[PDB]
Amino acid sequence: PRSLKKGPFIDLHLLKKVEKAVESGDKKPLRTWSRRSTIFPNMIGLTIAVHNGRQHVPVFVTDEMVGHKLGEFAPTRTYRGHAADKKAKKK
Amino acid sequence: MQNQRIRIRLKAFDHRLIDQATAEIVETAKRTGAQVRGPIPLPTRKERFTVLISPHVNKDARDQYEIRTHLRLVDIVEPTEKTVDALMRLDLAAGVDVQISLG
Amino acid sequence: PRRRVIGQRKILPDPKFGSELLAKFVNILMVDGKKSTAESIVYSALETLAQRSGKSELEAFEVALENVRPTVEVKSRRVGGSTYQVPVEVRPVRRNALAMRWIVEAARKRGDKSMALRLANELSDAAENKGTAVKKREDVHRMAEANKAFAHYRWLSLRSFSHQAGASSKQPALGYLN
Amino acid sequence: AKQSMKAREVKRVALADKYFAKRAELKAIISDVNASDEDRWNAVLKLQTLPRDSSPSRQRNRCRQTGRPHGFLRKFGLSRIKVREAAMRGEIPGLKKASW
Amino acid sequence: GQKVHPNGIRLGIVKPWNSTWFANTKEFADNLDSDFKVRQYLTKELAKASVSRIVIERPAKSIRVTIHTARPGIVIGKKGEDVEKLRKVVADIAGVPAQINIAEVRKPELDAKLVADSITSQLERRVMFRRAMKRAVQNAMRLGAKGIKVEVSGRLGGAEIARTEWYREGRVPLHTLRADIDYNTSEAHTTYGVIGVKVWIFKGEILGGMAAVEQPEKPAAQPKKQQRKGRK
Amino acid sequence: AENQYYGTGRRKSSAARVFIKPGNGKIVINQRSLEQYFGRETARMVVRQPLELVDMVEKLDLYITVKGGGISGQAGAIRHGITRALMEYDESLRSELRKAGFVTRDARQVERKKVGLRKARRRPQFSKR
RNA sequence: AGAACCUUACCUGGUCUUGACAUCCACGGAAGUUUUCAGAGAUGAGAAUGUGCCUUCGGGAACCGUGAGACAGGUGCUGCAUGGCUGUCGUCAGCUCGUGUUGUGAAAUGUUGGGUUAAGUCCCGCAACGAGCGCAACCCUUAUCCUUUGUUGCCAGCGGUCCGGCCGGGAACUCAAAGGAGACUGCCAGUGAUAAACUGGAGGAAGGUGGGGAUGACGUCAAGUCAUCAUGGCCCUUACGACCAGGGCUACACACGUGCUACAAUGGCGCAUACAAAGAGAAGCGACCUCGCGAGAGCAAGCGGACCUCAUAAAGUGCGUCGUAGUCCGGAUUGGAGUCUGCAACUCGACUCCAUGAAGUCGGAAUCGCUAGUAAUCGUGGAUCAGAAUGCCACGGUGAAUACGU
């Protein structure tokens, strides 16, 4: 297994996004480039739009996803299935 | 066996140049001191390189370059201060760097 | 091809007994370069053989190397629309090695609970001409009596031969106009 | 070849000294086992984002002459092709073709 | 287009290296890149002279330029201002202060880069090349040496095809390790693009211009050389 | 005549140094016993193998020094060092031992791992088409 | 030659246009460094340390932010538009320069024959004469071995003594870096047209240019690089430039090229047991140390590497043990915990290690290197090197069948 080693991360980018977001409880989805960032208690009930490189994809932040990174809910690679080859695109 | 009192070390890439530069230091030490030895060969280091031979592709043909590095030690069992004074004064080489520092 | 005559290596007696005929045996007993094991397998086999008959440890090895020995070989060299086979009588260095190969080729499938036993059983057996490589002999001489029919692009070779101080008849042997 | 990876490297070495010097020893002090119930406090390790391009993990340097990436050799400060042009003409001390 | 480069295997015996200094591994790249920068920017200044080689050498606390020339006076200029300006910039590039000497001039008409500047001038200047290859060869064999090869490329006459031509005469060894032997590949521009000449010239199979050291170890240095063999 | 005759025991670029003398049949290896140098090794019957061959177990006393190589091999050189050292009991001694191979050094010399090849001679494998 | 971002070309998202980087001008700031806050970071705004260089004492360069130009910049396009460079044939054993002669000339001749070879090597010989290129050689290396050194090298003997050169000491001895020695079909014999040369003899490590490397003809193939770089033609230059970030080739329906290790018992299991070479360690590694199952942790003498360390070198050996059952071979996966390089380990990073435990029993079509230190096989170190080697380079362990014949 892999880990986060030993130091403390809160991410600089989510600290400053979250501080302005919490004050209303919630507002419209926060435009996020931070795919490096873990999910945290401070972020519970926010809606984080996560750039995947092509576009932002909405991740709804909630208690069950705190063991995880923002970049896990938001996808990257495309899988061609083998019922039959993928004919179409998905955005 | 003996314990190393002091280290004088000669480092070069040209093998004839180092053999000549130690033999002359050895001469200076017998002429300008009393307690000298004949130069210890010491093992030679060699660094290994591999590169292409064409700009692009041709995996089979390849190139290998070598660079050799020669180490002489002398090991004068006692230098007089007057020996060390002549050594550093009559220095002028480029194929060899002579080291008199200790560590 | 080949401009001049080129030589062969010579095996120098092994380090744990002092025999050339054993140092050549251990060389084909080698798997993954490991002659220093193939030595350990020869001497451990030989000693099990030595309980079976005490007059020599080499008894059943030395007679195996005579009895399963092929005396004749069949060779192959394609001609056009045909492959054919052409018999030759074989040189002693390969007579000896074929038999050494065949004793060890049979041993590694004997399934016995130690390789020293596997090799010791196939030697006790091939010494009495009852074992696994009596068949390997039998076949290799059959081919050499059967393939006496064929020649190398024969119909034109048979005039070419007759003027080169050859016979009025098909020579069943390699690399001659026949 | 391209100028953009070489430009990246030129701008990076000034940002190594400017961002990175003050963070140099900071991994051992604030994070690892010496930061057992000492430091380990978020507010000084959110400050390593400025050094994020300046990070030891992008101190890959490549050719020193051109800034050109891939196939590098640290001992000359060159690469395969650029070592070869100078070895061919003897421009590098002690370096020759190999036989033994 | 074959062969590992002909002068490159010769670099360890009776051909000198183009540079000679030593840096103890960790500083060897920093010294190699400065050794290049002195090559590149110094030759820019002497553009108007004619020069066959550039040799850069680094003792303690010093950098020594050797330069090899078509004549001794060509780099000095009027009243040494010129050669001070050369040393000025060698001192600016290098982590040390600078010395410069002009070498003794020996076979400057048969030397690798100076014979090839003479031959490249004909193609550069777009002369017919009906007689050139023969007049190049006539003058190399009239001034000295034992054999020459010239190969000329860059689309002779202005061509829109690949177009090469060549000339060998006398003796030109290729797989030889002993003596210096002079090769140059020129690069030069004209109206239609880059042109280039590959020039092997062969002066002698024994040449004393770099030779092994005067003594072996065994006769050299101290008269009483035998050890005590212990006895501290 | 000298205090100990000496053999150079060359096999495969390893040197068995072997000082032979008259004594009571003994062996010394790297200033210790057989159990020390050749601990649980076949190497102990190796070093006995040249001493049996010329029928001299009970007549040579020996002092043996050896470096480099693999252990079964170090002994294999000592098997050459013991016959190397023997030359002078009689004038033919060296002629007969040279004819059997036990003075004769392993005339095969290393081939360097070669440029452009995966070994010394091993050229790439390609089907490429 | 060591793909999270970087790298990276590709694609998208923020943001400016002299611009990442140079000179030159305009305007604020010295650059360098430290610091709060907004902003994803870029960027921007403010703060404190410093206030250098020159001076029309205004103000500028330097360097940075801003702006405009000349201009910088382009993995921009074209490899029948190129230069520089290298690959194929092939170790083919041939190819060419100078010159004459024979034909009207294109072109022959030599460069073809007999004998022989690594060889245009060498005996014989014709219109081929004269001569060069490949090969042959010098060359480096190795092997003994001659030679000098005598340590961080060695130690028949001698001392403390675990019998380690650590040390009192000792030179019988490898041994290391360096001059290099020896081997030439020259000797002798058989063969071969005298003969090159093949084989045998003998001393020596070794007889067949001693082993190994260097080593590659003129040059078609229009082979391939505009992406090392030179560079004309020739296009953008608010960009076919630049900062910053994220994402990818490491995708999955699969096939294929290659290498690894395996499919056993020649082995593996447990316990005990042995010796390497070569090189890396100046920015770095590092004994002992105390913690830790290990990895690692945090401290650190010490180092300059023939002293210390990577590193327990493994395979191989000892003993007892195992039977085709995918096991007693093989150990992949995956769950889980400890650890690491870095703001940051999710797809795409490393390491230790606990438990369970598959495929595969030598495989169709396909398919390659090798003449002997080779092939095969086993481990090591290094080059690269943030973090990652099955690979490359070299090294040492152990080390094969045969080469009749064309």
Side-chain angles (χ1 to χ4, degrees):
Chain A
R2 309 180 194 289
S3 64
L4 297 81
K5 202 172 36 70
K6 286 295 196 81
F9 180 68
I10 71 158
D11 195 280
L12 182 52
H13 326 10
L14 269 295
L15 166 74
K16 291 175 169 187
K17 292 171 204 185
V18 162
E19 194 166 70
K20 302 299 178 285
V22 84
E23 286 195 55
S24 61
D26 193 81
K27 60 164 303 286
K28 296 304 206 175
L30 300 181
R31 196 175 172 166
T32 287
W33 293 258
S34 196
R35 192 179 175 82
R36 296 314 202 211
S37 167
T38 284
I39 291 153
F40 293 108
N42 74 354
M43 297 149 76
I44 287 189
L46 300 202
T47 309
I48 300 307
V50 176
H51 187 228
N52 76 344
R54 172 190 66 239
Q55 76 186 351
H56 302 252
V57 188
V59 175
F60 310 82
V61 172
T62 186
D63 58 79
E64 46 184 313
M65 297 178 185
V66 180
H68 294 281
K69 299 191 68 164
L70 282 169
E72 291 196 280
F73 307 102
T76 28
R77 307 206 180 136
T78 297
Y79 33 99
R80 181 247 296 109
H82 52 280
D85 177 97
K86 184 173 76 274
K87 299 316 297 185
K89 306 152 174 300
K90 302 182 293 184
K91 192 177 175 169
Chain B
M1 185 62 210
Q2 196 177 357
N3 163 63
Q4 280 288 357
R5 314 111 276 108
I6 191 150
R7 297 81 75 172
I8 296 172
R9 45 204 170 232
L10 294 92
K11 307 190 176 195
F13 52 87
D14 189 19
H15 34 70
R16 283 164 286 159
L17 244 279
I18 194 181
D19 180 70
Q20 188 168 244
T22 198
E24 181 165 280
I25 283 162
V26 172
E27 189 55 76
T28 304
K30 189 58 66 191
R31 199 191 73 248
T32 71
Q35 302 84 355
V36 195
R37 290 178 182 136
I40 271 48
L42 202 81
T44 285
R45 307 182 64 99
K46 176 170 68 175
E47 306 96 85
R48 307 172 288 280
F49 296 100
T50 284
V51 302
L52 49 71
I53 184 65
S54 197
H56 291 62
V57 68
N58 307 296
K59 165 178 155 146
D60 286 287
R62 215 76 189 276
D63 193 62
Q64 167 66 34
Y65 274 137
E66 81 177 343
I67 186 167
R68 304 198 197 191
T69 296
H70 305 308
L71 298 179
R72 288 294 180 313
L73 181 73
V74 64
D75 179 74
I76 304 176
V77 51
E78 269 300 285
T80 74
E81 285 63 73
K82 181 178 182 289
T83 297
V84 170
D85 173 59
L87 209 184
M88 293 169 75
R89 181 191 65 250
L90 287 153
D91 296 337
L92 54 70
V96 44
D97 180 72
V98 63
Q99 178 179 350
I100 69 295
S101 310
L102 187 67
Chain C
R2 302 187 175 173
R3 278 174 192 106
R4 68 74 137 193
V5 62
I6 196 62
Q8 209 163 45
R9 68 104 82 246
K10 182 164 201 67
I11 197 67
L12 180 142
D14 76 282
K16 288 187 207 73
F17 195 86
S19 157
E20 197 177 328
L21 187 74
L22 290 162
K24 196 182 161 168
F25 189 105
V26 294
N27 288 343
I28 73 63
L29 189 50
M30 185 175 102
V31 280
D32 315 76
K34 302 315 289 84
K35 196 214 84 177
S36 71
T37 307
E39 293 180 74
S40 195
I41 291 316
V42 97
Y43 293 111
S44 188
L46 283 167
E47 204 300 296
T48 293
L49 275 178
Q51 313 184 73
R52 300 202 184 104
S53 61
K55 318 188 292 279
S56 186
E57 81 179 52
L58 273 165
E59 175 66 282
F61 173 104
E62 195 166 49
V63 174
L65 291 162
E66 275 63 272
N67 287 34
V68 301
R69 210 186 251 174
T71 293
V72 258
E73 275 285 53
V74 87
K75 310 302 185 178
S76 194
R77 295 184 180 200
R78 32 61 175 64
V79 287
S82 297
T83 293
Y84 290 151
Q85 292 293 326
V86 273
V88 91
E89 171 166 296
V90 54
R91 293 62 65 185
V93 72
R94 194 85 194 101
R95 283 186 171 150
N96 190 18
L98 280 158
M100 287 184 179
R101 282 180 174 301
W102 301 341
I103 288 159
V104 165
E105 188 173 80
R108 187 160 194 211
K109 68 179 162 275
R110 210 170 196 81
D112 308 280
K113 290 199 175 88
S114 65
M115 178 66 185
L117 182 70
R118 292 190 186 118
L119 180 44
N121 285 0
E122 174 54 357
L123 284 164
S124 193
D125 295 24
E128 299 179 329
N129 191 63
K130 77 173 192 190
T132 302
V134 187
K135 199 63 170 82
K136 307 180 179 173
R137 190 194 194 190
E138 181 177 59
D139 186 72
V140 164
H141 288 225
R142 193 50 274 285
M143 288 186 294
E145 295 180 288
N147 290 115
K148 293 161 164 172
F150 315 128
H152 285 308
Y153 173 68
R154 74 174 152 257
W155 301 101
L156 192 49
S157 301
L158 178 75
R159 167 175 268 157
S160 296
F161 190 44
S162 279
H163 284 121
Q164 282 171 4
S168 55
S169 181
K170 300 180 201 301
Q171 203 183 3
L174 35 62
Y176 321 99
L177 286 165
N178 39 34
Chain D
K2 205 60 179 63
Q3 186 70 259
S4 205
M5 305 84 66
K6 329 175 146 196
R8 204 80 179 218
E9 195 39 67
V10 178
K11 180 60 78 174
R12 170 176 299 122
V13 173
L15 300 177
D17 302 324
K18 183 46 179 66
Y19 305 131
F20 203 66
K22 34 180 183 195
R23 315 300 175 247
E25 300 171 282
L26 207 79
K27 301 298 302 195
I29 300 294
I30 311 289
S31 294
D32 284 73
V33 176
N34 204 272
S36 171
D37 194 49
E38 187 202 78
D39 310 280
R40 204 182 278 181
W41 181 24
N42 43 273
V44 283
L45 220 87
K46 63 187 182 69
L47 299 185
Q48 299 191 311
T49 312
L50 318 170
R52 175 182 44 184
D53 179 93
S54 323
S55 283
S57 53
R58 318 203 198 204
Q59 298 302 329
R60 306 201 72 204
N61 168 46
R62 310 99 52 201
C63 301
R64 286 177 195 192
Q65 208 42 85
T66 53
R68 181 180 194 240
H70 61 241
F72 181 69
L73 300 165
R74 186 188 287 292
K75 191 265 185 289
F76 306 113
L78 292 182
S79 60
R80 298 168 58 91
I81 198 54
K82 291 213 63 24
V83 155
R84 189 220 67 185
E85 190 57 45
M88 285 180 157
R89 311 315 318 249
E91 291 183 340
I92 316 181
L95 188 305
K96 59 186 181 185
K97 191 63 179 159
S99 55
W100 56 95
Chain E
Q2 292 302 313
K3 313 178 283 286
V4 174
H5 208 87
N7 71 76
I9 179 63
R10 303 173 177 140
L11 294 178
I13 59 294
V14 213
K15 190 184 183 76
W17 280 279
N18 199 257
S19 291
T20 54
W21 52 258
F22 187 90
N24 186 52
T25 71
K26 167 178 165 202
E27 294 117 310
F28 201 96
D30 302 288
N31 287 47
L32 188 60
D33 275 78
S34 190
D35 175 82
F36 289 24
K37 293 185 285 181
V38 174
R39 159 179 297 97
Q40 279 176 65
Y41 317 160
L42 187 62
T43 62
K44 220 187 293 300
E45 313 286 281
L46 59 69
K48 74 313 196 173
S50 307
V51 303
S52 70
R53 233 162 140 179
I54 180 169
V55 191
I56 302 180
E57 309 175 286
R58 294 175 161 72
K61 209 59 187 72
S62 66
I63 190 173
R64 295 194 287 204
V65 174
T66 305
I67 186 157
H68 190 349
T69 68
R71 64 173 186 92
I74 207 166
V75 206
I76 302 168
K78 200 175 177 71
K79 215 170 181 58
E81 184 54 57
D82 205 293
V83 72
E84 189 304 307
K85 269 179 300 172
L86 266 63
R87 191 196 86 224
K88 190 178 65 178
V89 303
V90 176
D92 180 33
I93 299 168
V96 278
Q99 186 187 90
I100 185 163
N101 58 78
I102 316 294
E104 177 68 62
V105 162
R106 68 175 294 204
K107 300 305 80 67
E109 71 300 294
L110 299 176
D111 248 66
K113 177 176 182 301
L114 302 171
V115 65
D117 173 67
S118 293
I119 318 164
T120 313
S121 178
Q122 283 199 282
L123 184 66
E124 170 174 38
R125 301 193 305 112
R126 292 161 272 137
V127 317
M128 62 177 170
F129 216 89
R130 284 177 172 267
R131 317 183 193 249
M133 209 60 153
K134 211 189 176 164
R135 291 194 290 238
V137 169
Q138 189 60 289
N139 174 110
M141 302 320 301
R142 190 179 62 187
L143 298 165
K146 294 188 191 177
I148 204 178
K149 187 182 179 214
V150 195
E151 197 158 280
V152 77
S153 260
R155 54 175 271 164
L156 275 54
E160 234 71 75
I161 58 185
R163 189 171 284 179
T164 193
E165 191 204 314
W166 153 83
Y167 213 104
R168 189 170 56 198
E169 219 199 275
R171 171 154 191 235
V172 183
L174 301 186
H175 64 302
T176 178
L177 270 60
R178 151 78 161 276
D180 188 291
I181 293 164
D182 284 290
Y183 175 77
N184 182 87
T185 189
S186 56
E187 288 205 291
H189 190 240
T190 198
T191 283
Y192 61 69
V194 196
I195 56 148
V197 197
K198 310 173 295 188
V199 190
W200 297 245
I201 197 160
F202 168 72
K203 296 171 180 190
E205 191 61 39
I206 307 80
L207 198 80
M210 156 163 170
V213 284
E214 299 184 53
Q215 300 183 98
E217 188 44 60
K218 310 131 191 83
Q222 52 202 35
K224 175 49 171 58
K225 200 177 194 165
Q226 196 72 259
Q227 257 285 309
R228 307 182 299 274
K229 283 171 174 172
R231 199 61 79 169
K232 288 67 175 158
Chain F
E2 69 183 282
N3 191 81
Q4 24 66 252
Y5 296 100
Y6 161 71
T8 179
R10 299 300 180 151
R11 185 199 74 96
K12 202 181 178 200
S13 317
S14 72
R17 299 116 76 194
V18 176
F19 320 98
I20 71 169
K21 79 196 298 142
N24 295 304
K26 289 191 298 292
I27 198 183
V28 187
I29 177 84
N30 293 86
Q31 298 190 356
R32 293 188 310 204
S33 56
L34 289 179
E35 186 68 79
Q36 281 284 104
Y37 216 87
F38 297 134
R40 303 164 179 280
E41 210 71 51
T42 39
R44 295 167 296 191
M45 187 54 182
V46 177
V47 296
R48 208 64 67 200
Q49 190 49 64
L51 298 173
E52 283 167 286
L53 171 77
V54 293
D55 204 292
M56 283 173 143
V57 167
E58 71 293 294
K59 295 188 283 187
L60 286 188
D61 171 284
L62 292 122
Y63 300 121
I64 305 182
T65 290
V66 77
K67 297 187 186 302
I71 192 62
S72 321
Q74 289 170 268
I78 292 156
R79 183 167 170 318
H80 181 299
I82 293 167
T83 36
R84 202 57 165 65
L86 278 169
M87 72 190 81
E88 71 317 288
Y89 281 86
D90 67 296
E91 301 306 282
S92 277
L93 183 42
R94 212 184 163 74
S95 195
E96 254 57 76
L97 291 167
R98 201 170 58 258
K99 286 165 194 186
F102 300 126
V103 175
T104 288
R105 178 275 144 35
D106 171 52
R108 292 183 302 223
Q109 315 294 356
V110 66
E111 186 163 329
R112 43 181 308 253
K113 302 294 174 198
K114 204 179 180 180
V115 58
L117 312 179
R118 295 190 193 264
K119 308 201 287 181
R121 289 194 167 104
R122 192 65 158 105
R123 200 184 190 277
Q125 191 157 310
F126 275 105
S127 184
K128 72 202 160 182
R129 184 178 288 98

